[PDB]
Amino acid sequence: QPNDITFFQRFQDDILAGRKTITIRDESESHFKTGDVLRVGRFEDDGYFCTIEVTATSTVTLDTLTEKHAEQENMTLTELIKVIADIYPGQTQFYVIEFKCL
Ligand SMILES: Nc1ccn([C@@H]2O[C@H](CO)[C@@H](O)[C@H]2O)c(=O)n1
Ligand SMILES: [Mg+2]
């Protein structure tokens, strides 16, 4: 059973603890949708660590990301924009995946 999605492993504990309940992705991962049950691995080694259920999705842009998105990523807003600037350089169109770890 392969993984459907990965996260940087520095987020693993936040996810398992329920501190991170959304993830902000680009068009490459815009196909995930409410009701999806997804196997989740670490980006660095593809090691499975949980199965999530997608509970909501929405679109967002760089200039419409909010303090609340940051809070749900378990980050400050400044920290979130910094991460996006590195992961998705030059990009402005994003996709919010809200989820719970099963
Ligand atoms: N909000 C985000 C966006 C991305 N990522 C990780 O970065 C990889 C490449 O985008 C993704 O495959 C994922 O591992 C993340 O952990 N959190
Ligand atoms: Mg940086």
* Spatial separation of the C-alpha atoms in residues 55 and 91, rounded to whole Å: 25
Amino acid at 82: K
Domain range summary for the chain, segments of one domain joined by +: 5-101
Q: CA-to-CA distance for 88 and 32, rounded, in angstroms?
A: 18
Distance in Å, CA 90 to ligand 1 centroid: 16
- Distance between Cα 72 and ligand 2 center (Å): 19
Give the span between the Cα atoms of 95 and 29, in whole angstroms: 8
**Residue 82 annotated to the active site:** no
Q: How was this model experimentally determined?
A: X-ray
68 a catalytic residue: no
What is the spatial distance between Cα 12 and Cα 29, in angstroms, rounded to a whole number? 19
79 is catalytic: no
Nearest-atom number in ligand 1 for the CA of 28 is 10
* CATH code at 5-101: 2.30.130.30
Name the nearest CA neighbour of 32 among 15, 50, 55, 11.
55
**Distance from C-alpha of 25 to C-alpha of 102, rounded to nearest angstrom:** 21
Which residues 6+ apart lie within 8 Å of 5 measured at CB?
Answer: 23, 29, 32, 38, 39, 40, 41, 52
Q: Among residues 6, 20, 21, 57, which one is catalytic?
A: 20
Nearest CA to ligand 1 atom 5: 7
